[PDB]
Amino acid sequence: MIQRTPKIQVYSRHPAENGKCNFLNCYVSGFHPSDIEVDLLKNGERIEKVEHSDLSFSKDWSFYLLYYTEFTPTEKDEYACRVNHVTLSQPKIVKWDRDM
Amino acid sequence: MIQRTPKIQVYSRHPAENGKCNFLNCYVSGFHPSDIEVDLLKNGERIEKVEHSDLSFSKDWSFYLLYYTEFTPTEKDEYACRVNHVTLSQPKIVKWDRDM
Amino acid sequence: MIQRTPKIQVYSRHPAENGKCNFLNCYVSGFHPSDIEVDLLKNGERIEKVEHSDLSFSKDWSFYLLYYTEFTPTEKDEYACRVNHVTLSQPKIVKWDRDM
Amino acid sequence: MIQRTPKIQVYSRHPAENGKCNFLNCYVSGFHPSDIEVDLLKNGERIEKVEHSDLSFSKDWSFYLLYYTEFTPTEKDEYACRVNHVTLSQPKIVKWDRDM
Numbered sequence A, B, C, D: 001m002i003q004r005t006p007k008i009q010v011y012s013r014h015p016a017e018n019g020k021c022n023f024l025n026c027y028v029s030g031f032h033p034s035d036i037e038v039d040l041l042k043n044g045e046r047i048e049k050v051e052h053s054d055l056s057f058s059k060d061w062s063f064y065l066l067y068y069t070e071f072t073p074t075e076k077d078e079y080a081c082r083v084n085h086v087t088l089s090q091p092k093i094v095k096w097d098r099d100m
């Protein structure tokens, strides 16, 4: 099928509270082809190697992937999701907005 | 990920009986990349009615697909599954064996 | 959780055409508890073969079950679905309407 | 279908480390009927009200459910899963073993 650029959404499972265990999610959706490089960053640095969830699926040849890690939010730490695909000229970085 | 040739299996859901409504299946498994051409054939012509399940994937990026159609078997008619992929030099035809 | 009466829908997978192999379905939805008796009838007589899907439930504990069989529709034959549950006083019979 | 007692398994998603955000799972499997009361305890007291995962399913009228919460393991704290079902005379408590 024809190439399609992924939509990237970065969010925490529950409202962020410093010192309270949570899980950070990077949902990459509606893309084609499947070959994708997804990394979760903590202060511009990759945390642990995590692959797509079992909840991840395919619909009308397009791909819908979810990557998640458990984390304790802190005041000075900055979180982001780095995504690289054939449809992108350079790797895209989507920052995590605590207020969203 | 690296290229992987599909395993092709052609079978009817229930033991074949002439004049008795059944379901013909073509199960293509353990392949990479996802782009695949799958068509169910009846003698000369291609069955232009064939449906498919959703494209399912493993953690190791191997794809699984099931193509199916409702059919009434008959002693004279010959059924087959034509599969084309990047790993194949020419389209592979797997005939349906009523006895297996 | 509290008792909930099932919604019964009887339909063929594709629009009915005499002599053309199809699937007759009986979709029992939004019920509680899970224990249910579902039978497909051909001219008031119960079809022996009858297959069923896996039991599916919502986060709120309502059940969704699908009962199906391969069939060839004919002009002279009448189809129905007999459903029995704790919420029903007597078994409910839902006739198959070809035009619905 | 006939009554079947659940098999209860309590485990953390990753090897336990004090002060490191994790997931505490309680997998209740192969039970019938569906009506079940599952609570995760911290020193004999319930945590936040947790519903079953979307990975939860049904197989041959039996039920397979997964309940999970965030949590940060600490040295003093004891974790357990309290399960109540019709097949049990009194609520069963399965303690979390860090080494299992």
Ligand code: NA
Binding pocket: A097, A098, A099, A100
């Ligand atoms: Na903001």
Ligand code: NA
Binding pocket: C097, C099, C100
């Ligand atoms: Na009508």
